[PDB]
Amino acid sequence: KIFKPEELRQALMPTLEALYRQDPESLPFRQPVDPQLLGIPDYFDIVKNPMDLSTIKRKLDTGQYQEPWQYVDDVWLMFNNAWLYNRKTSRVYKFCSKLAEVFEQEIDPVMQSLG
Ligand SMILES: COc1ccc(CCc2nc3cc(-c4c(C)noc4C)ccn3c2NC2CCCCC2)cc1Cl
């Protein structure tokens, strides 16, 4: 099944917007983790493939997804990176858990509509 870039954008960008709408939970995710700025040199030792909302948005805007499960994969890579690196008591970790609940609800009917 072929998917057009604008078809993927029209279907999937509302689910990304739903994540941006989460406040405070989306705030640490709207831009890439910056280890130099945050003083965490070990970050890229642990997270070999960073992902964040702005990079997913750019990938959707520049047609880098050929199928919707590639978009889902990048959202879940965001989540898994954050659960992996951050302590379970931290804001980032608990915010990640909230985004995953939101995303699960938003993406389900959209994947049905795509087929
Ligand atoms: C309201 O929320 C917060 C407010 C302040 C803080 C401390 C500063 C801070 N700590 C992180 C951690 C990650 C991260 C992720 C994600 N995965 O691993 C790591 C590591 C990313 C950004 N951080 C930032 N910068 C801020 C976030 C908020 C908007 C502007 C930039 C924490 C949070 Cl929660």
UniProtKB/TrEMBL annotation:
Residues 21-93 form the Bromo domain. It is found in: Nucleus. This is histone acetyltransferase. It comes from Homo sapiens. The lineage of its organism: Eukaryota, Metazoa, Chordata, Craniata, Vertebrata. The gene is CREBBP.
